[PDB]
């Protein structure tokens, strides 16, 4: 249908505008100021002092290195808030909803979007960090001291097997707009309203894989098992981060992010 | 350092001194001889009868509405040509370059400092137009007739998000010095000594937004993804551009404007 067809264009074009990285742009980097590796304790040093001088312009003081991470890894997900929140206003009905409903939508939302698109910038060696202009290898992710070693790798997991079914842009921005669209997230007013707005764009998505993807039948029930998947992996991240918070005095967590997490699993 | 805060402050007195329109002027402006608005057909022809009197003396031998726009968009783009050129000298060691390579990156840099620098006339409602004596809706723009709407919607998209950084003046001049000190320009002979030049201007840079901005520990970083933004915003500006002028025969290029373009895209 042309509205139908214009309804994913739109979304496609949303992204295109809200999140600072895309996938194409993140494979431009990924192949080769050009993108500083880190691999190691000298390499993660040198990159702070380029790209967040101010994080390690304490002397002395400074944090421990993961904790240093831990820090880069939060600012992220604040930016990416935000980035998420205004491209929710392309979703059909989004805006009409009740500002609490958007709330709810958004807290529940935003760490399943995060993962799914934080894939556009992995592969099987690192992922691109600072806007492009790092590149932290998978290795020196695993060597970090318990417990910050283990927020990483489920979710290189997650993305080899996300990234394999070789999604481009344009599925992965209504993808985002569906997990946006949960009318099963708890604590919800109008959920019947919300079940009509997701139904709309997991309607396009659907047509949508069958025109730009005809090689794959079952991408769409797939991509359906990836939303499940990656709702347990932000229950598992939950957990994982509430254990940071409770032995770690010095990894602190942002207030929003503190908002979000809280009541959530 | 004292040389280097003294380099941060050179650069930023030569910005004022070398353009017409600053960030604070402009918003000083826009705030509210006041800015005619110009929203529509009937009061785009009331300013230009009043600020481009010439440009429509000609009758029925007027061009076309979106022609004269195109025309004044040029314009100004040959006044910045000139402002930017004079601005370069305070570049420690721009003008100790070859000539030929002083060319090359003003060639390569001028329209992406046009566009950073048109950020700060702009906000989500129009922009400043003709010395700050106009605001043109970006509604109006979007409402010409293609491809004439096409110039404009991308880089009020870059500008939105560009002035949500809330850079400064001061953070500005830096930033337009960057990108005129880029070596990885096309054709430049002396590449070595201006990485050299380029690494003195981006180390001022990076100092200085870690005093300007003790708030936005990311600030550098992504202030080097709106340079890589900003050659992608050129080379598919560049594109229309060449569009425009094969199919519109009235939209005459200015001979400074066609020998930037020539052999840049
Ligand atoms: C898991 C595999 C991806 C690893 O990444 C994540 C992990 C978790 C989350 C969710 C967070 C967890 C606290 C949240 O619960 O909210 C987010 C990310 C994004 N992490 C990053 O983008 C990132 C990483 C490591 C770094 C190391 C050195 C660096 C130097 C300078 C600038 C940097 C910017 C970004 C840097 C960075 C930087
Ligand atoms: C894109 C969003 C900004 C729109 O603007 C641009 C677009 C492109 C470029 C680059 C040009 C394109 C040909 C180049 O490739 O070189 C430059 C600009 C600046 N454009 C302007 O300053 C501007 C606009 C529209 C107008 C409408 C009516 C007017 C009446 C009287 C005086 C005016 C002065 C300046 C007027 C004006 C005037």
Partial sequence: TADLK????????????????????ARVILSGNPPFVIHDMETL????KTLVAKLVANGIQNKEAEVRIFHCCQCTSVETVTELTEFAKAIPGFANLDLNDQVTL????????????????????????AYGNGFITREFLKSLRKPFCDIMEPKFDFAMKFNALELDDSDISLFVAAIICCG??????????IEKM?????????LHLQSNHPD??????????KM?????????????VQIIKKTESDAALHPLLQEIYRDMY
Avoid: W
């Fill in 228 to 240: 499940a998947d990656l709702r347990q992996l932000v229950t598992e991240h939950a957990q994982l």
């Fill in 45 to 48: 040093c040198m990159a702070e």
């Fill in 216 to 225: 794959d039948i079952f991408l769409f029930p797939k991509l359906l098992q």
């Fill in 198 to 206: 997701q139904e709309g764009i997991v309607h396009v998505l659907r």
């Fill in 6 to 25: 214009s309804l994913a264009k739109r979304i496609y074009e949303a992204y295109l505008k809200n999140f600072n990285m895309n996938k194409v742009k």
């Fill in 184 to 193: 099963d997230r708890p604590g919800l007013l109008n959920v019947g309203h």
């Fill in 106 to 129: 958004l807290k529940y939302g935003v760490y399943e979007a995060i993962f799914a698109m934080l894939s556009s910038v992995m592969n099987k060696d690192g992922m691109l960090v």
